[PDB]
Amino acid sequence: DDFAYLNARVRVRRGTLLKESFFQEALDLSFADFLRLLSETVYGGELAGQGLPDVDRAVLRTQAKLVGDLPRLVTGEAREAVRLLLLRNDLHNLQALLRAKATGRPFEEVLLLPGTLREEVWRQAYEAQDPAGMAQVLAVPGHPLARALRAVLRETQDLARVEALLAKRFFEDVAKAAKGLDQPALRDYLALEVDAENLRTAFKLQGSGLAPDAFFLKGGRFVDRVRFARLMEGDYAVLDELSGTPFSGLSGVRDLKALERGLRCVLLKEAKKGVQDPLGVGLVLAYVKEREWEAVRLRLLARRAYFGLPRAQVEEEVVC
Amino acid sequence: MAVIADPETAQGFRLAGLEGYGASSAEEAQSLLETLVERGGYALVAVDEALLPDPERAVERLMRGRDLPVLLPIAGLKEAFQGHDVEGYMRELVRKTIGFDIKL
Amino acid sequence: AKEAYAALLLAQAFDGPEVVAGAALGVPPLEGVEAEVENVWGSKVPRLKATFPDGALLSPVGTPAYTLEASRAFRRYAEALIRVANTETRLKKIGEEIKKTTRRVNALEQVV
């Protein structure tokens, strides 16, 4: 409920982070200097030993400590709003549970990263022959993913087309919940993320010749179904048509890596504008995205010092 | 179609959709190669160059005939930064293969 | 190889190791590589080519933005690998047959 009580600790956590100068100092290290620099960091609070696996577990534990408490310390509408921030790992674990139910792998087969609720829900949903019963066991009161599973649950039991339609319906329910709250900036950031995700999945499935109406979702503002069809067709003119929108630098590019890096930079610039809302929750989402980019850069420096990767190969990552 | 540099690269091979492994020692790699020749991954194996250059001891161990599991040296993810030996590697290929040493 | 290595570096550094674990283990092992026969100068070796089915579009809205790119990089990687394997076995057959013909010429000359 209170978007200031958690925001005080959010500003305290925004004061306590590693700067980009720490990453520029990590641009020339051999995982020992990088391990000492990360040992001084907050991941040094979770840095058990050495190696890329210990550093990755430390970064994951630091992220679960920083953002897992954001699911706590709140109740009600702002709790549902913060629940509609970290929907990536929870939907990944739900899709992994659906793939395990439709594949036949064991319950210990999934590695089961930190989602949004307790892992006992996923443990009980391992032994779940009923997918509607599995969604009801996974039904939290503010979890819209269980609502999307119940909505798409009257199509089949466990299908991959059902999984793709449920992912599209989950994005649609996230957009409906973002429209259904008193936060236009978070709704705008979610709509920009949904439009960039539609452009990303369309450019990834470009040239497939499939039904774009089966692929394009509803809720986008910078692009329409005609713009999505012109982008899915072999033409970067629609990508050149994105003028004035947040895809400013995205012009005349047909690649996936550079386009995804530019989309990540545009989303980071959009979340960087979240400092204007002090009494809302956009500072919390900005800190979450900044910690995500910082931990991704730390894992990138760890892998670069592991395999001896070039700084010129990682120079396209230091801008964000 | 086993490929053995790391299990970390091998789960990338699973991300390609083929079976792979990682051992980080010689006899362990030859033993898993041995059960892979015993029950097939359709008999086409590459092993890391810093792990085993020539695993053909496993060929003469189990399956001397038909040369069906083809064994390949391969450049590891921590080694593909340098472009391993290519021209001197062909020098030692000629030295191994025809007896003579050439320059060409 | 360098292309697929950089693709995996980006797709597990900018992303989750748990999600590349789930993305790998959701995909089946995809058996199906097969072989045909070369008979030349009597000598016979089997050369192989792979099927590599792309039909496993497991929820084809791929939940990371990178593992389709890296996965096709590793598919091209394996194509190049089976190419190098066939080149290898052809060159080994030629080498051992030159060894046979050299000891045959030397033996036939110096003995009979």
UniProtKB/Swiss-Prot annotation, chain A:
Molecular-function GO terms, alphabetical: ATP binding; proton-transporting ATP synthase activity, rotational mechanism; proton-transporting ATPase activity, rotational mechanism
Regions annotated as coiled coil: none
Listed GO biological process terms: proton motive force-driven plasma membrane ATP synthesis
One annotated Gene Ontology cellular component of this protein: proton-transporting V-type ATPase, V0 domain
Disulphide bridges, residue numbers: none
Pfam families noted in UniProt: vATP-synt_AC39 (PF01992)
UniProt entry keywords in alphabetical sequence: ATP synthesis, Hydrogen ion transport, Ion transport, Transport
Family (UniProt): Belongs to the V-ATPase V0D/AC39 subunit family.
Function: Produces ATP from ADP in the presence of a proton gradient across the membrane.
Protein name stated in the entry: V-type ATP synthase subunit C
Organism field: Thermus thermophilus (strain ATCC 27634 / DSM 579 / HB8)
Gene for this chain: atpC
From Swiss-Prot, chain B:
GO molecular function: ATP binding; proton-transporting ATP synthase activity, rotational mechanism; proton-transporting ATPase activity, rotational mechanism
Pfam families xref list: ATP-synt_F
Residues that span the membrane, as ranges: none
Keywords: ATP synthesis, Hydrogen ion transport, Ion transport, Transport
InterPro entries, sorted: ATPase_V1-cplx_f_g_su (IPR008218), ATPase_V1-cplx_fsu_bac/arc (IPR022944), ATPase_V1_fsu_sf (IPR036906)
Function: Produces ATP from ADP in the presence of a proton gradient across the membrane.
Family membership: Belongs to the V-ATPase F subunit family.
Protein name according to UniProt: V-type ATP synthase subunit F
Organism name: Thermus thermophilus (strain ATCC 27634 / DSM 579 / HB8)
Gene name of the record: atpF
Curated annotation (Swiss-Prot), chain C:
Alphabetical UniProt keywords: ATP synthesis, Hydrogen ion transport, Ion transport, Transport
Statement: the UniProt record of this protein carries the keyword Transport: yes
Biological process terms in GO annotation: proton motive force-driven plasma membrane ATP synthesis
MF GO annotations: ATP binding; proton-transporting ATP synthase activity, rotational mechanism; proton-transporting ATPase activity, rotational mechanism
Keyword Iron found: no
Functional description taken from the UniProt entry: Produces ATP from ADP in the presence of a proton gradient across the membrane.
UniProt family annotation: Belongs to the V-ATPase D subunit family.
Protein name: V-type ATP synthase subunit D
Gene source species: Thermus thermophilus (strain ATCC 27634 / DSM 579 / HB8)
Complete-protein stretch covered: 57 to 168 of 223
